Design an enzyme around this catalytic site. Structure first.
Site, PDB file in Angstrom:
ATOM      1  N   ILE A 127       7.450 -33.821  52.447  1.00  0.00           N
ATOM      2  CA  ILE A 127       7.651 -35.203  52.783  1.00  0.00           C
ATOM      3  C   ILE A 127       7.352 -35.423  54.258  1.00  0.00           C
ATOM      4  O   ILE A 127       7.410 -36.557  54.796  1.00  0.00           O
ATOM      5  CB  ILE A 127       9.091 -35.597  52.323  1.00  0.00           C
ATOM      6  CG1 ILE A 127       9.039 -36.714  51.310  1.00  0.00           C
ATOM      7  CG2 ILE A 127      10.056 -35.780  53.426  1.00  0.00           C
ATOM      8  CD1 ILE A 127       8.568 -36.226  50.005  1.00  0.00           C
ATOM      9  N   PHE A 161      17.852 -39.525  51.101  1.00  0.00           N
ATOM     10  CA  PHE A 161      16.385 -39.675  50.992  1.00  0.00           C
ATOM     11  C   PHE A 161      16.086 -41.173  51.047  1.00  0.00           C
ATOM     12  O   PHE A 161      16.827 -41.960  50.415  1.00  0.00           O
ATOM     13  CB  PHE A 161      15.911 -39.108  49.616  1.00  0.00           C
ATOM     14  CG  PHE A 161      14.481 -39.354  49.313  1.00  0.00           C
ATOM     15  CD1 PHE A 161      14.099 -40.408  48.470  1.00  0.00           C
ATOM     16  CD2 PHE A 161      13.490 -38.576  49.919  1.00  0.00           C
ATOM     17  CE1 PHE A 161      12.711 -40.613  48.199  1.00  0.00           C
ATOM     18  CE2 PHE A 161      12.144 -38.779  49.671  1.00  0.00           C
ATOM     19  CZ  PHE A 161      11.758 -39.799  48.831  1.00  0.00           C
ATOM     20  N   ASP A 192      14.161 -39.228  70.664  1.00  0.00           N
ATOM     21  CA  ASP A 192      12.757 -39.184  70.126  1.00  0.00           C
ATOM     22  C   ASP A 192      12.537 -40.272  69.076  1.00  0.00           C
ATOM     23  O   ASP A 192      12.008 -40.032  67.952  1.00  0.00           O
ATOM     24  CB  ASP A 192      12.401 -37.789  69.583  1.00  0.00           C
ATOM     25  CG  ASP A 192      10.894 -37.602  69.349  1.00  0.00           C
ATOM     26  OD1 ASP A 192      10.115 -38.346  69.989  1.00  0.00           O
ATOM     27  OD2 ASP A 192      10.485 -36.697  68.556  1.00  0.00           O
TER      28      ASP A 192
HETATM   29  C1  LIG Z   1      15.724 -37.675  57.781  1.00  0.00           C
HETATM   30  C2  LIG Z   1      14.917 -37.020  56.649  1.00  0.00           C
HETATM   31  C3  LIG Z   1      15.097 -35.521  56.413  1.00  0.00           C
HETATM   32  C4  LIG Z   1      14.486 -37.940  55.547  1.00  0.00           C
HETATM   33  C5  LIG Z   1      15.105 -38.772  54.587  1.00  0.00           C
HETATM   34  N1  LIG Z   1      14.050 -39.436  53.992  1.00  0.00           N
HETATM   35  N2  LIG Z   1      12.884 -38.994  54.673  1.00  0.00           N
HETATM   36  C6  LIG Z   1      11.607 -39.365  54.501  1.00  0.00           C
HETATM   37  N3  LIG Z   1      11.258 -40.273  53.556  1.00  0.00           N
HETATM   38  C7  LIG Z   1       9.971 -41.004  53.716  1.00  0.00           C
HETATM   39  C8  LIG Z   1       8.870 -40.385  52.849  1.00  0.00           C
HETATM   40  C9  LIG Z   1       8.993 -40.375  51.468  1.00  0.00           C
HETATM   41  C10 LIG Z   1       8.019 -39.800  50.646  1.00  0.00           C
HETATM   42  C11 LIG Z   1       6.879 -39.209  51.197  1.00  0.00           C
HETATM   43  C12 LIG Z   1       6.742 -39.204  52.606  1.00  0.00           C
HETATM   44  C13 LIG Z   1       7.744 -39.788  53.417  1.00  0.00           C
HETATM   45  C14 LIG Z   1      10.620 -38.755  55.340  1.00  0.00           C
HETATM   46  C15 LIG Z   1      10.932 -37.813  56.335  1.00  0.00           C
HETATM   47  N4  LIG Z   1       9.973 -37.252  57.131  1.00  0.00           N
HETATM   48  C16 LIG Z   1      10.246 -36.175  58.089  1.00  0.00           C
HETATM   49  C17 LIG Z   1       9.789 -36.399  59.549  1.00  0.00           C
HETATM   50  C18 LIG Z   1       9.931 -35.051  60.271  1.00  0.00           C
HETATM   51  C19 LIG Z   1      11.393 -34.662  60.619  1.00  0.00           C
HETATM   52  N5  LIG Z   1      12.088 -35.796  61.227  1.00  0.00           N
HETATM   53  C20 LIG Z   1      12.011 -37.093  60.525  1.00  0.00           C
HETATM   54  C21 LIG Z   1      10.550 -37.493  60.336  1.00  0.00           C
HETATM   55  O1  LIG Z   1       9.960 -37.722  61.672  1.00  0.00           O
HETATM   56  N6  LIG Z   1      12.242 -37.482  56.474  1.00  0.00           N
HETATM   57  C22 LIG Z   1      13.137 -38.113  55.626  1.00  0.00           C
END
Ligand SMILES: CC(C)c1cnn2c(NCc3ccccc3)cc(NC[C@@H]3CCNC[C@H]3O)nc12
Length: 278
Positions: free
Chosen positions: A8, A71, A116
């Site tokens: 993700i 999520f 950040d």
């Molecule tokens: C805070 C975290 C662990 C969390 C909860 N939902 N979610 C989604 N969801 C968006 C998404 C959904 C499906 C496909 C891609 C992105 C994306 C995501 N991306 C991770 C990146 C790298 C680590 N820090 C947060 C962000 O910059 N981190 C998270």
């Protein structure tokens, strides 16, 4: 204990999977990452707010670190890239800004900074909510983007304040409005020089103590400021007035999240729902 569904994203602090808890049925974001980090991170478990991605669990086992988060289905970068032709409508921009300022007023009141903020760290749902992700992880612990970094960090100030989050959020606001990043630096000096080119080279008049900063050089070029009306059209006068207070050089003069919630820009704030393609 978790079934990986898909990758993700990939953060500073390790890689992130959408995952399913085999016992609860719960769908979560599983992030795989010293006793000091453990205590800091555990303090984050209590820092709970509707505009902050909920840390569900900290799994310190087999000498490894996994953080289990709520999520969300979509991030603000992807929503912006997907809203490119018409832009995010203004009432939605304002509602996202207002909610993010609520989450920051919360964390800051508890003396916790983000450090950040960036569009990829701002996550959205179908209900019209926007949430801050990775809060506290930088103090607890691909090229890292500098586009949202406050000038005092770039100037080598060792002891940053809550003002650094307001700067980043200021930058994100401008970007939602114009559909272009405000300060897209590709190195620290380019980043700093892009800020100076737009806001003027800071001096002792606008930012007392600046010339004493660790990476300040008397030899910086001296650029004059530009008007916010050239910088963020079509933002109205209230949005321009708020943004300029969010982008004040001096971190002590920078508006707080709590004062920003009272600014006239928010007088007609509402909570629209986005058109979200999942
Ligand atoms: C805070 C975290 C662990 C969390 C909860 N939902 N979610 C989604 N969801 C968006 C998404 C959904 C499906 C496909 C891609 C992105 C994306 C995501 N991306 C991770 C990146 C790298 C680590 N820090 C947060 C962000 O910059 N981190 C998270």
């Amino acid at each position: 204990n978790f079934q990986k569904v898909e990758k993700i994203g990939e953060g500073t602090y390790g890689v992130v999977y959408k995952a399913r808890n085999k016992l609860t049925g719960e769908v979560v974001a599983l992030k795989k990452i010293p006793s000091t980090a453990i205590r800091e991170i555990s303090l984050l478990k209590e820092l709970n707010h509707p505009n902050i991605v909920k840390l569900l669990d900290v799994i310190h086992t087999e000498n490894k670190l996994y953080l289990v988060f709520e999520f969300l289905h979509q991030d603000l970068k992807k929503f912006m890239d997907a809203s490119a032709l018409t832009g995010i409508p203004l009432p939605l921009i304002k509602s996202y800004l207002f909610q993010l300022l609520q989450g920051l007023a919360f964390c800051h009141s508890h003396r916790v900074l983000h450090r950040d903020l960036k569009p990829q760290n701002l996550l959205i749902n179908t209900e019209g909510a926007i949430k801050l992700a990775d809060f506290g992880l930088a103090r607890a612990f691909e090229v890292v983007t500098l586009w949202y970094r406050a000038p005092e960090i770039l100037l080598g100030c060792k002891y940053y304040s809550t003002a650094v989050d307001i700067w980043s959020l200021g930058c994100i606001f401008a970007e939602m409005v114009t559909r272009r990043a405000l300060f897209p630096g590709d190195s620290e000096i380019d980043q700093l020089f892009r800020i100076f080119r737009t806001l003027g080279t800071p001096d002792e008049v606008v930012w007392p103590g600046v010339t004493s900063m660790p990476d300040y050089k008397p030899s910086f070029p001296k650029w004059a400021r530009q008007d916010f009306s050239k910088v963020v059209p079509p933002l109205d006068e209230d949005g321009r007035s708020l943004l300029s207070q969010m982008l004040h050089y001096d971190p002590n003069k920078r508006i707080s999240a709590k004062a920003a919630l009272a600014h006239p820009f928010f007088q007609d704030v509402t909570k629209p729902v986005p058109h979200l393609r999942l």
